[PDB]
Amino acid sequence: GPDQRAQKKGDIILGGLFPIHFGVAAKDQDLKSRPESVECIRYNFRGFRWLQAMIFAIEEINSSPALLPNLTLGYRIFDTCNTVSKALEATLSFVAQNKIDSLNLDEFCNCSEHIPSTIAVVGATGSGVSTAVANLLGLFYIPQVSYASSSRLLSNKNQFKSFLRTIPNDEHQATAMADIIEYFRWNWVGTIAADDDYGRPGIEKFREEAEERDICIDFSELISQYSDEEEIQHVVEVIQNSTAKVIVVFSSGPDLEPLIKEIVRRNITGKIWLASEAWASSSLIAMPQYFHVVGGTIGFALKAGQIPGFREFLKKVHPRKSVHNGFAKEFWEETFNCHLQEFRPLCTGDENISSVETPYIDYTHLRISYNVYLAVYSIAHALQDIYTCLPGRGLFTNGSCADIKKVEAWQVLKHLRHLNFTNNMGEQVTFDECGDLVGNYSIINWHLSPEDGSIVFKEVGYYNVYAKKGERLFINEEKILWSGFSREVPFSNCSRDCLAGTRKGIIEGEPTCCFECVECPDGEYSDETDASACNKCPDDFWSNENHTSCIAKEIEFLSWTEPFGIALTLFAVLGIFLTAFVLGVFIKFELSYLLLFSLLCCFSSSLFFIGEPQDWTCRLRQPAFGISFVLCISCILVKTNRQFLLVFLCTFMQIVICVIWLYTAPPSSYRNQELEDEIIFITCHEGSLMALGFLIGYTCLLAAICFFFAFKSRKLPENFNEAKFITFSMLIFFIVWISFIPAYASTYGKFVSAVEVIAILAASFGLLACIFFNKIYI
Amino acid sequence: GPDQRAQKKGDIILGGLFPIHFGVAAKDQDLKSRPESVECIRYNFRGFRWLQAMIFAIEEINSSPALLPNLTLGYRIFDTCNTVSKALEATLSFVAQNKIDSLNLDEFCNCSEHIPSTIAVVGATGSGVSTAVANLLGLFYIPQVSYASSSRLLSNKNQFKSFLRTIPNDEHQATAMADIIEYFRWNWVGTIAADDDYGRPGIEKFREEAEERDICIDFSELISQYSDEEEIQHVVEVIQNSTAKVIVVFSSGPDLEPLIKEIVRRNITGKIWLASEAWASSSLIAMPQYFHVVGGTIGFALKAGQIPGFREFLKKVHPRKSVHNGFAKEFWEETFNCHLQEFRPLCTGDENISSVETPYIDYTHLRISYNVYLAVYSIAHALQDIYTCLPGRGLFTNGSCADIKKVEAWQVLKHLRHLNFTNNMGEQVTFDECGDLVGNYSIINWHLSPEDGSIVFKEVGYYNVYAKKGERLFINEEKILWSGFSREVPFSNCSRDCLAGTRKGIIEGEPTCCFECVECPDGEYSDETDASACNKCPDDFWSNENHTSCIAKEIEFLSWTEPFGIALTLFAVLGIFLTAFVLGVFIKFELSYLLLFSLLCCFSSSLFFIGEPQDWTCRLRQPAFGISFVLCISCILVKTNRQFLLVFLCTFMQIVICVIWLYTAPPSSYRNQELEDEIIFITCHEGSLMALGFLIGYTCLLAAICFFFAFKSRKLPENFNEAKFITFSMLIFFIVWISFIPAYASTYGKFVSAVEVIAILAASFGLLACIFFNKIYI
Numbered sequence A, B: 001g002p003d004q005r006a007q008k009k010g011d012i013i014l015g016g017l018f019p020i021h022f023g024v025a026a027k028d029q030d031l032k033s034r035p036e037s038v039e040c041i042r043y044n045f046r047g048f049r050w051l052q053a054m055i056f057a058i059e060e061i062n063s064s065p066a067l068l069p070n071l072t073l074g075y076r077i078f079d080t081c082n083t084v085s086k087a088l089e090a091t092l093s094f095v096a097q098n099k100i101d102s103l104n105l106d107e108f109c110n111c112s113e114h115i116p117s118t119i120a121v122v123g124a125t126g127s128g129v130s131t132a133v134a135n136l137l138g139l140f141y142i143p144q145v146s147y148a149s150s151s152r153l154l155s156n157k158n159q160f161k162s163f164l165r166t167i168p169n170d171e172h173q174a175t176a177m178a179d180i181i182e183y184f185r186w187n188w189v190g191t192i193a194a195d196d197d198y199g200r201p202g203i204e205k206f207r208e209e210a211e212e213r214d215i216c217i218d219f220s221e222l223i224s225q226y227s228d229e230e231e232i233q234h235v236v237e238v239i240q241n242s243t244a245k246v247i248v249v250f251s252s253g254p255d256l257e258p259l260i261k262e263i264v265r266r267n268i269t270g271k272i273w274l275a276s277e278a279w280a281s282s283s284l285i286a287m288p289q290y291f292h293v294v295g296g297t298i299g300f301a302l303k304a305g306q307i308p309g310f311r312e313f314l315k316k317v318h319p320r321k322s323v324h325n326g327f328a329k330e331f332w333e334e335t336f337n338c339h340l341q342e343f344r345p346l347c348t349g350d351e352n353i354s355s356v357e358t359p360y361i362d363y364t365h366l367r368i369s370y371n372v373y374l375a376v377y378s379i380a381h382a383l384q385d386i387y388t389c390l391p392g393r394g395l396f397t398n399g400s401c402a403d404i405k406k407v408e409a410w411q412v413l414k415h416l417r418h419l420n421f422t423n424n425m426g427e428q429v430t431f432d433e434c435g436d437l438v439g440n441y442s443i444i445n446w447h448l449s450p451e452d453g454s455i456v457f458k459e460v461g462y463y464n465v466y467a468k469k470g471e472r473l474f475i476n477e478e479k480i481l482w483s484g485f486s487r488e489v490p491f492s493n494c495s496r497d498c499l500a501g502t503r504k505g506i507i508e509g510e511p512t513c514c515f516e517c518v519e520c521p522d523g524e525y526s527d528e529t530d531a532s533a534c535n536k537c538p539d540d541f542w543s544n545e546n547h548t549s550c551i552a553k554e555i556e557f558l559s560w561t562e563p564f565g566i567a568l569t570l571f572a573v574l575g576i577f578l579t580a581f582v583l584g585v586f587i588k589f590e591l592s593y594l595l596l597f598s599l600l601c602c603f604s605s606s607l608f609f610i611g612e613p614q615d616w617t618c619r620l621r622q623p624a625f626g627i628s629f630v631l632c633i634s635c636i637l638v639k640t641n642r643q644f645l646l647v648f649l650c651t652f653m654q655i656v657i658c659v660i661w662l663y664t665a666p667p668s669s670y671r672n673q674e675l676e677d678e679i680i681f682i683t684c685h686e687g688s689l690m691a692l693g694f695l696i697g698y699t700c701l702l703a704a705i706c707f708f709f710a711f712k713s714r715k716l717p718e719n720f721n722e723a724k725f726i727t728f729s730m731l732i733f734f735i736v737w738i739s740f741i742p743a744y745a746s747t748y749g750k751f752v753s754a755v756e757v758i759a760i761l762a763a764s765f766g767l768l769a770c771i772f773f774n775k776i777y778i
């Protein structure tokens, strides 16, 4: 190892593993000369104060005699600047005295220094570093306690048997990560993890919860602090080639830094951020030059801790007082940008500690330092439980304890598996077989000190864990500033929630977070804006133009009080009045009475076939044939071959045909539906041929009888050409009955029945005129 | 470490890592007492002879002075019974003297033993074990040479910098694994890998090649030697719940053993096997009790090797000669099932070596032992190149070599990166930056010694690697015995290659290895048995009943020589003969000549409208109207009001109407298509109303003229009721022309034209009879 160490002697050595530099240099060895270790060129003041938080509690235990009397404590602490290489290079020296059973060819000085073996060890930050170092110490059962390693792979106790945490596991952070977008009500998001044991398994767990809550994922990407610049530009083009305003960033501190500088050069705005706790308080990331594109940044953190005298101990520093710190002189030079020696100028070693801005001392809270501060205490308190072994009631076979002068790491781990004691601020730190405890999380926003631009972290709520699901989370939303200032919550669903008129269809391949919306046709009336399917209307309605609630009814094919038909009804009334005047002339000055009365009935027949149709109004078309067949009695009575009341021989035949037809054909108005929107009509639905047979048996039978009896009398003037007038009236009635047929066969609705009505009225008026006017006016 | 070691002193220590036991015991430590290492209860004679192959070549280098004179060689070899735990427990003692710069608190005896550091080390078998141990030695650049670790993760030189192989990599085995089922012509298979660094990445590479060659995968499963018995039953139920006769097993030796015993209890047969080379020669697996369900087992292996004196050295064994072997006495007791000491009886230490069946000595070839035997030599030959450093032309800065008494592992690795020398049997072992070489593979079958039942491994070909793709592989298939004895190659496609009549459709979700097949309808004629889609027929064909090549033609609606129409044509000929007899009587004993001639033309008119239709045969229906209008001249000439040659006044009108119609309507036979299979007809397609207008203007005009001229003469007998006969003939012709209309309007094809033909013939025959017979017979 180097001189870069932290070591004081003592009865039991502890040692620790700490990131004094974020990034390592990455030189390529070439084997032409003697290879050597690599200097790691970055810094972490938070790591240096983590060292201070270690050694302060160390000296607390040494000074306090209530905590392990007659026992000075050693340590041999090394820097692991985020490489498993130097982590292994350190921990091989940790597995040293236990290798005396393996390396025993040093017999002449095998107990010269007589070193106590490093009994336990404070772990390391990065999950990859801890998983690398855990496999070695699982062999010797040397208990290793991490403080920041927070991946669920280490919860396995098959491989990692000698591993404990003073930090909660990651499943609850994945749970709250699902629940925050649940409460924030989104379905469409893309995430970015780190390509190691911290990012990948936790983002896999978040993928589990995302498909539990049916939240579709845009993308899942991986970066590191050694990522390729083309790959960073590639994933940035992936971001700009897609759309999800929220992003689950689930990485450590310095791994985002190249991507972050690249993005602030790329000047992408609008996308907002979700933070894992490994970078949710990242001072090197939290910079006001980056607060244009970061901000509104929501994350989690641990609760604060309290250490007495600690700020004073942090300013109890001096480079020629670093008898147990190799890193302190380099820290002094690096803070003061100079070159002390026993470009960069000299250093006086006497400057003010609280003079310059540094995250070493300009903190607000104690979280991971607090975890270390209680971690070394929990080691010491399990050790204290060994120190007061109950005489015969230890944690061994038969409770048979051993001495404290010869204590072994497996005994230490056995007592560490059952350690039931409480905090200095009164919290029972108690280990399950997951090797940790669990606490709550704060929930912050990256706000801004507006006059200074220092990115402040306002608590906007928290996440309890001690409740159950659907119950653990509370956010006061009333201090959230989305995109740093916008009070309104933004939009991150993929497809828009469409309006009322278009029902929400589905695209193949893409799930429910991004759909399509299609306006259904022809009776759509889709009322709700976000129902996936619409309904079809009932009978009395048709769709709106904007396909809203269908109210447009059907047709009104009745022509009852229609102005086109009312004038024809008035003309029929005038014809009836002319017939009344002719009968009044015939009365004042069988053919005289009944031929006039049956003609009046044939005139009044079609007037009972007008209006909105019904049962009786439908069956009243049979009297339009019967009264015309009765009015044809003059055509048989007034022939030149003129017992006269024997018109019953055809009247009863027509009546019997109608009595059969009343049960054969339908005497009921038939409301058909020909069109779609306006289709309400009435057409009476006669049976198959009943009306045609009755018409052929009455009308064109009596007219043909009159024509066959007057074919000889047409060339015969008698009673002032009354035979000529009768033949002309018979021809006119036959012409009207012939012309009414195709206009009934080629029509519909209110265009069909009016033709038959007007034709019957016209034929009656013509025959009545050609008889009565030529009779009377002379 | 234990006494279970292999150690002789020497100037440079080497050491190795070897599986003396397949499985370890898996006791759970409970920390109530002193924990300790676990005894591993299995054995591997192949591992023991691998130790022998190490130490024999070691003593060869020591005895040979041409190979490194004045240099005895140490070793410190340990057993790694397939656990990374004991592998690490070994290799911590390997990184020992290099830790003097780290552990320097042993100053009073830091050079007492003055141990030379273990300069290089022969690696280990299992890929997980080698990847575990490689990360440690990559730090110190101690070159480690494996011999069996064959995963492509170790081809990376970023992490594993100090790693070399004397075994080819796995990409070519995955390539040949794709090519063997390519040549064996399958598309549907399910695989089983081992759940570690050997199985998983290679089976991932095979998945790449499977989707390259478009070979769909049934399943990809993972087992170990610590698999769950319910999981083994679960994957066996997965096998029985699916179907693929070939199985890519891609694991080590003992990991299949629980699954294999479970399967031979489960008694699944029919499935055949593909072997990776890690178990393709697995003697503990190759058992005759298992050769019922295994057999036909195809795999790969390395070529054999040759070591002189080696069989004698293997039988140069004695337990009280094991001065550098801790495992040898246990090997002696384990072979002889006894208990030597200085139930199981005593051991004499003097039994015959070649007395019992054991895979220690009952081998056939040298493959991995050969790899070790050349591996230690390649270490020694790079060391020899260091020994004759060219004075100033080494592999350093300026070629500046160092001494052999103080040699470092980075110098050794530098010379190992450039080592260009040849085998004892003359093959240039030369390392690229993949840290290996590449050789061919044999391709075997697990045959049977039929009288002894020992599963013999007949070579059934090989796999060259030095060619390119599509070129590297040759199999003589003529010794393959599928399922151990069946000469025919079996079937493992998912869906069957269907017959000709059903075109191959596609199922959603499942790719081309498993499809559907559907018989297309209505002109299918799908000729090829394995074309995905069919075609539709040309016009002159319709489909077969079994939907094969469509040959069934269309209809023959001509009725030219039809027996139903030939009798009617003969009746028309008899009517023409009767007309000829009547004209002969009228000649022997205008109406006399032309009314007979035009009647003969009207008789012969329809006879030119019979047969298969054509242009002139289609236009010959106009003469059927013209000659009938000419034959109606008697109806105007023979009236009772009887200049006579003025029939031209209507003949020219009919001719001008026909001359207009010849250009108006189509004078061409119209082959319609009404049906589907048999639809070939002829219907002449007249224009819109031309034939109807010409018929109304000629036929029912002349007949109505005759009727209006004879309505008074019907009650007038003259010339023996010739007026009555003429009126009856006119009524008959009008009745025939009226009856021919609906039978033409409601028919088709050969049912329509024959009606008009027979009606014209009947009307002509009736009119000619009613004139001529009543004229002549009196």
Ligand SMILES: *[C@@H]1O[C@H](CO)[C@@H](O[C@@H]2O[C@H](CO)[C@@H](O)[C@H](O)[C@H]2NC(C)=O)[C@H](O)[C@H]1NC(C)=O
Residues within 6 Å of the ligand: A185, A186, A187, A491, A493, A496, A497, A512, A513
């Ligand atoms: C974004 O989409 C989600 C679902 O994809 C919407 O959540 C639904 O909201 C409606 C009313 O807002 C609720 O009745 C549903 O129960 C919610 N879905 C689920 C699964 O609970 C969310 O409203 C959408 N937000 C925006 C702004 O479009």
Ligand SMILES: *[C@@H]1O[C@H](CO)[C@@H](O[C@@H]2O[C@H](CO)[C@@H](O)[C@H](O)[C@H]2NC(C)=O)[C@H](O)[C@H]1NC(C)=O
Residues within 6 Å of the ligand: A439, A440, A463, A464, A465, A466, A467
């Ligand atoms: C973790 O969060 C919970 C929040 O549910 C805290 O519970 C509070 O406990 C105090 C003391 O009993 C109560 O007065 C509060 O009403 C609780 N808050 C609730 C119910 O919302 C709890 O203190 C937090 N810390 C720990 C260590 O459990």
Ligand SMILES: *[C@@H]1O[C@H](CO)[C@@H](O[C@@H]2O[C@H](CO)[C@@H](O)[C@H](O)[C@H]2NC(C)=O)[C@H](O)[C@H]1NC(C)=O
Residues within 6 Å of the ligand: B185, B186, B187, B491, B493, B496, B497, B512, B513
């Ligand atoms: C199993 O299926 C494969 C393909 O899924 C078949 O291989 C095809 O065979 C035909 C003729 O046998 C060739 O014309 C094709 O070129 C082959 N396909 C490819 C992709 O090359 C194979 O014949 C099938 N075997 C059985 C027994 O069904």
Ligand SMILES: *[C@@H]1O[C@H](CO)[C@@H](O[C@@H]2O[C@H](CO)[C@@H](O)[C@H](O)[C@H]2NC(C)=O)[C@H](O)[C@H]1NC(C)=O
Residues within 6 Å of the ligand: B439, B440, B463, B464, B465, B466, B467
């Ligand atoms: C690897 O396999 C190839 C097979 O392609 C072997 O090549 C043979 O080489 C000999 C010697 O030159 C020729 O006589 C043969 O005709 C080759 N076989 C062919 C072309 O099929 C080769 O020997 C094998 N071994 C090595 C180490 O390359």
Ligand SMILES: N[C@@H](Cc1c[nH]c2ccccc12)C(=O)O
Residues within 6 Å of the ligand: A125, A126, A127, A128, A148, A149, A150, A151, A197, A198, A252, A253, A277, A278, A279
């Ligand atoms: N939990 C992280 C370590 C970590 C937590 N907080 C951090 C802050 C900075 C750097 C690393 C961390 C891991 O598993 O790797």
Ligand SMILES: N[C@@H](Cc1c[nH]c2ccccc12)C(=O)O
Residues within 6 Å of the ligand: B125, B126, B127, B128, B148, B149, B150, B151, B197, B198, B252, B253, B277, B278, B279
């Ligand atoms: N290649 C194997 C090791 C191996 C090769 N052949 C073997 C035979 C038996 C056991 C193991 C092996 C691995 O990577 O793990």
Ligand SMILES: *[C@@H]1O[C@H](CO)[C@@H](O)[C@H](O)[C@H]1NC(C)=O
Residues within 6 Å of the ligand: A267, A269
């Ligand atoms: C970055 O985007 C913001 C958003 O409008 C814009 O105001 C600013 O000018 C941009 N800066 C650069 C350098 O493109």
Ligand SMILES: *[C@@H]1O[C@H](CO)[C@@H](O)[C@H](O)[C@H]1NC(C)=O
Residues within 6 Å of the ligand: A397, A398, A400
């Ligand atoms: C009592 O203790 C001794 C030594 O600690 C041990 O050997 C013995 O098994 C124990 N007996 C019981 C019953 O625990």
Ligand SMILES: *[C@@H]1O[C@H](CO)[C@@H](O)[C@H](O)[C@H]1NC(C)=O
Residues within 6 Å of the ligand: A420, A421, A422, A428
């Ligand atoms: C031991 O743990 C239990 C858990 O409920 C707790 O009640 C008890 O107070 C603990 N004992 C001590 C001494 O703290």
Ligand SMILES: *[C@@H]1O[C@H](CO)[C@@H](O)[C@H](O)[C@H]1NC(C)=O
Residues within 6 Å of the ligand: B267, B269
């Ligand atoms: C195993 O299957 C074979 C295949 O037919 C059969 O002959 C044999 O009897 C079976 N054995 C058992 C134990 O089921």
Ligand SMILES: *[C@@H]1O[C@H](CO)[C@@H](O)[C@H](O)[C@H]1NC(C)=O
Residues within 6 Å of the ligand: B397, B398, B400
């Ligand atoms: C020559 O060798 C010395 C020592 O080996 C070295 O320092 C020097 O750089 C070398 N010069 C060249 C040009 O290689």
Ligand SMILES: *[C@@H]1O[C@H](CO)[C@@H](O)[C@H](O)[C@H]1NC(C)=O
Residues within 6 Å of the ligand: B420, B421, B422, B428
């Ligand atoms: C070195 O390698 C080359 C590679 O082609 C070979 O030709 C040559 O023979 C090798 N040298 C020796 C000494 O074997």
